Amino acid sequence: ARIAGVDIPRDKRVVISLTYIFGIGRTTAQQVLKEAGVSEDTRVRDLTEEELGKIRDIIDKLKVEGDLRREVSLNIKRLIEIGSYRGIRHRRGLPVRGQNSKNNARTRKGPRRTVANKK
Amino acid sequence: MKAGIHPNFKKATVKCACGNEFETGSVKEEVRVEICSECHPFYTGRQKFASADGRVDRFNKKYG
Amino acid sequence: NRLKEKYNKEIAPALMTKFNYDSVMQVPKIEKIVINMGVGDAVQNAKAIDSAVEELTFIAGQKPVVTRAKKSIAGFRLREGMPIGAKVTLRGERMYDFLDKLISVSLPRVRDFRGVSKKSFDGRGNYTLGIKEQLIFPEIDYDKVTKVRGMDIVIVTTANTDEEARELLTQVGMPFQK
Amino acid sequence: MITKTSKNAARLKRHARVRAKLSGTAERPRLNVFRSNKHIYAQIIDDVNGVTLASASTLDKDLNVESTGDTSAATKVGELVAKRAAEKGISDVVFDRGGYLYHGRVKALADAAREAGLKF
RNA sequence: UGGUGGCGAUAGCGAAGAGGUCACACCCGUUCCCAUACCGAACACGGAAGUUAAGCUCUUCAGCGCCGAUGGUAGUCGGGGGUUUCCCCCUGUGAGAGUAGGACGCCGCCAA
RNA sequence: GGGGCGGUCGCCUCCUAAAAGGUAACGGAGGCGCCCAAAGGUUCCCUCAGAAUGGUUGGAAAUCAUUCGCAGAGUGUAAAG
RNA sequence: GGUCCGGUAGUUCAGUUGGUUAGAAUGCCUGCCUGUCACGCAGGAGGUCGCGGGUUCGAGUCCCGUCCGGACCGCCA
RNA sequence: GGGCUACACACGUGCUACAAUGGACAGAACAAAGGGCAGCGAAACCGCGAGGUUAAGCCAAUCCCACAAAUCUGUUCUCAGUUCGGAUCGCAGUCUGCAACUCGACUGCGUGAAGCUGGAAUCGCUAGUAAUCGCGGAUCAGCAUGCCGCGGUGAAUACGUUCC
């Protein structure tokens, strides 16, 4: 479990079912299915005994789950050892793309708490 | 071997999507298997599979 | 039994030429595998630790036995009684019927895994390995178990030294990270 | 890497604990048993002198099982031990189970001796 | 060479050499008896393919453990005398500790 | 070691008690008015604590494999044996 | 000097006996209420249990020692 | 060259959502007003897209910016951190500009925070108003969730002056 992207779900149509794969998104799924000719097909999981394999190969050409996590990880590790400034933003809790800090930007900062008063 | 505690083990028929088969033993009469050592890229020598590691690093960026 | 015949014809003769042996006949041999559960309870009230015990019957046909604690722990439950985890000691023809499933099927199935075990050797002989998914074992259904429970394997080598114990494993086809 | 105790010295500890259970000697001979992998030797010794009053074995030029070393054939030898003892008028010997479990086929050797007239 | 005993690790650990045709073993099987909080590992049974590698016994080793004097002192016995929260001499006792040395075993029975 | 006040009054372990035993003080350290139908009886088996190494969620420790372990354990409860 | 009772949020008191767990008021902090404060409303943090040991699986709790704060005695010639 | 964009946090004010009156896909259909020559730039072609190549027309009731969006019609998902939402970030491109690190915009791909309607408290609005959907302009090399306008769809309630 499973034949291609590991741990694809069940009782869902195949396109959203492999969008869950850490790699393929929506439009990429539209492309791999355009190569497939499945036409959707199948709402549940019942494709075909061999077609599941040929799709397994095309998905195999795409790459790849936790190694793709290793891509981003090795990339940011490349972005910290380089100096730096971008990875510096990655670990300050500072947003990296460049969008102030005086308000909001809590996506990294977190909620609580507060430690100031006047007067 | 205690009686009735241990499930019966009929001769297994391991199978795979690549058509590879293996003769073992299991509770089930037949066992389809998604992945085998003869199909997995690591056990099968050093197949490119999808990588092609290190392409490209740490630098190869030029355009004219 | 195919794995069992394999070292009787292929591995042993190659192993014999790799280095000298006293009294010719001597050769390292697999002894017992010990599979650990651990479970972790969290906390004591599983409530059914036995439900995990049933799950291990699938990974191996030998009946699991719960490991009652012989010591109390201040940090976690419990004083003696109310057993934690389970243990299995498969042997004989079961040994290679299980190992054949390990190389051919179990380990490759894992996502991030490509190879392990470098410093893992004791320097004496015994091999050790960790197992973090029931998806790793083909016989288990995905619908069962739901929440993940941990697993272990400990191959034993007759050889008195790890240098011999390692070389025996390599010819078995056991993966290494290198 | 494993080095389990050999199937011998561990038995002697199991044998020695049995020794406390009965003195054996009292002008009444005891009957020790040793199950070698091929066959079982049998002997009779009494304190203080330590003299072996009688002895017999499955391995001898006399008598052929002929298969030897298994099942009921041992009973013919176990009965033979009493026949040697019978010449001495011996006796009512205590049995020495050793570290081995009492069920068989060592038990079968004890059974034939009772048929041979030994009192135990 | 195997089994089974008695003598206080002077019978031991460790290290280095030796052995097996018979005997002792590992070893090979789980259909039966018996089995295993589970397991032919162990425990039981029935088999001779493989060898001593281990176990088992022989040959060496004072590195460790052990045994251990002779001789001296401490202490003390019966006495006595002083500088008496103790000390000193007489008589008879005699340690420890260390050393010299011993030692990696003998005495039996049964079977071949 | 005047009385009063305080504390104590019985049983059990060690030391003080001086290499039989005994042996005092308001001497020195501790426990007990229980507990268990099993932790009893018998039979058949097994050997600890702690350490090192390897290991999934296991961290200084729950679990498991291994060399080390003459007992550094356990022996219902407290000490000696 | 001799006994007895206590030491816990910043403060004032529970929780201790019943052994595996720390609460309340006030104060403090945040947001409201009002043109200003208080008051009021709605949220939030904060104690390691005086210290040093022991017993136990595990001690705020039990058993001791110790440092402090109190409450009783300290008399008869 | 920096900084005016700081960052443990508080507050004011907007935007987007927390979804089946919905999401996604396909088809079909109705605007107004404004801007444009150092400009708007059609059509044709190249690129998945952004844009680029090239170039007609227009000093404009002619032509261009420009396609209106909600909606309607069907297909599909069937109640969940979801085909809900899009955050954050990675990679690869693109427009403007000597020059996009600080500190620009946009696109493709990938990653898929929080949030399942919000305490105390508080604001707007009596009809084409509130509700909501798109468009244009001033600003302007580039940068508009802000501001100023344009039109589409389009309600509920008003007993009354007890009380603020």
From Swiss-Prot, chain A:
Q: Which Pfam families match?
A: Ribosomal_S13
UniProt cross-references to PROSITE patterns, sorted A to Z? RIBOSOMAL_S13_1, RIBOSOMAL_S13_2
| Claim: tRNA-binding is one of the keywords in the record | yes
One MF annotation (Gene Ontology) recorded for this entry: rRNA binding
Where along the chain is composition biased (Basic residues)?
A: 105-119
Chain segments carrying region Disordered: 92-119
Q: Which UniProt keywords apply?
A: Ribonucleoprotein, Ribosomal protein, RNA-binding, rRNA-binding, tRNA-binding
Question: InterPro entries, alphabetically?
Answer: Rbsml_uS13_C, Ribosomal_uS13, Ribosomal_uS13-like_H2TH, Ribosomal_uS13_bac-type, Ribosomal_uS13_CS
GO CC list: cytosol; small ribosomal subunit
For the biological process aspect of GO, one term held by this record is:
translation
The entry's family comment says:
Belongs to the universal ribosomal protein uS13 family.
User: Which PANTHER family does the UniProt entry name for this protein?
Assistant: 30S RIBOSOMAL PROTEIN S13/40S RIBOSOMAL PROTEIN S18 (PTHR10871), SMALL RIBOSOMAL SUBUNIT PROTEIN US13M (PTHR10871:SF1)
Its function, per the record, reads:
Located at the top of the head of the 30S subunit, it contacts several helices of the 16S rRNA. In the 70S ribosome it contacts the 23S rRNA (bridge B1a) and protein L5 of the 50S subunit (bridge B1b), connecting the 2 subunits; these bridges are implicated in subunit movement. Contacts the tRNAs in the A and P-sites.
Note the subunit structure: Part of the 30S ribosomal subunit. Forms a loose heterodimer with protein S19. Forms two bridges to the 50S subunit in the 70S ribosome.
Q: Specify the protein name.
A: Small ribosomal subunit protein uS13
The primary gene name is: rpsM
Curated annotation (Swiss-Prot), chain B:
The induction annotation reads: Only accumulates during exponential growth.
Q: Name one Pfam family in it.
A: Ribosomal_L31
Q: Which GO terms describe its biological process?
A: translation
Isomerase: present as a keyword of the record?
Answer: no
Q: Name one GO cellular component term.
A: ribosome
Describe how the cofactor binds.
Binds 1 zinc ion per subunit. This zinc stabilizes the protein.
Question: What highest taxon heads this organism's lineage?
Answer: Bacteria
In alphabetical order, the GO MF annotations are:
metal ion binding; rRNA binding; structural constituent of ribosome
User: What keywords are assigned to this protein?
Assistant: Metal-binding, Ribonucleoprotein, Ribosomal protein, RNA-binding, rRNA-binding, Zinc
Query: What cofactor does this one take?
Result: Zn(2+)
Residues that bind Zn(2+): 16, 18, 36, 39
The listed outcome for residue 36 to A is: The protein does not accumulate and cells grow very slowly
Q: Which family does it belong to?
A: Belongs to the bacterial ribosomal protein bL31 family. Type A subfamily.
Instruction: Quote the function comment for this protein.
Output: Binds the 23S rRNA.
Subunit comment for this entry?
Part of the 50S ribosomal subunit during exponential growth.
Name the record gives this protein: Large ribosomal subunit protein bL31
Which lineage is the organism of this entry classified under, starting from the top rank?
Bacteria, Bacillati, Bacillota, Bacilli, Bacillales
Gene name linked to the record: rpmE
From Swiss-Prot, chain C:
GO biological process: one example: translation
Keywords linked to the UniProt accession: Ribonucleoprotein, Ribosomal protein, RNA-binding, rRNA-binding, tRNA-binding
**Coiled coil regions, renumbered to chain:** none
According to the UniProt record, one GO cellular component term is: cytosolic large ribosomal subunit
The family line of this record is: Belongs to the universal ribosomal protein uL5 family.
Quaternary context: Part of the 50S ribosomal subunit. Part of the 5S rRNA/L5/L18/L25 subcomplex. Contacts the 5S rRNA and the P site tRNA. Forms a bridge to the 30S subunit in the 70S ribosome. Interacts with VmlR. In stalled ribosomes contacts MutS2.
Question: What HAMAP family does the entry give?
Answer: Ribosomal_uL5_B (MF_01333_B)
- Name listed for the protein in its UniProt record: Large ribosomal subunit protein uL5
Q: Which organism is it from?
A: Bacillus subtilis (strain 168)
Swiss-Prot record, chain D:
- Among the Pfam families in the record, one is Ribosomal_L18p
**A GO MF term:** structural constituent of ribosome
Gene Ontology cellular-component annotations: cytosolic large ribosomal subunit
User: Which gene is the coding source of this polypeptide chain?
Assistant: rplR
Q: How does it assemble?
A: Part of the 50S ribosomal subunit. Part of the 5S rRNA/L5/L18/L25 subcomplex. Contacts the 23S rRNA and 5S rRNA. Required for catalysis of RNase M5.
Which InterPro entries does its entry note? Ribosomal_uL18_bac-type, Ribosomal_uL18_bac/euk
Q: Which UniProt keyword terms apply here? A: Chaperone, Ribonucleoprotein, Ribosomal protein, RNA-binding, rRNA processing, rRNA-binding
Q: Which species does the entry assign this protein to?
A: Bacillus subtilis (strain 168)
Q: Which domain of life is it from?
A: Bacteria
Say what the protein does. This is one of the proteins that bind and probably mediate the attachment of the 5S RNA into the large ribosomal subunit, where it forms part of the central protuberance.
Task: Give the family, as the similarity comment puts it.
Answer: Belongs to the universal ribosomal protein uL18 family.
GO BP annotation list: rRNA processing; translation
Q: Which SUPFAM superfamilies match?
A: Translational machinery components (SSF53137)
By what name is this protein known? Large ribosomal subunit protein uL18
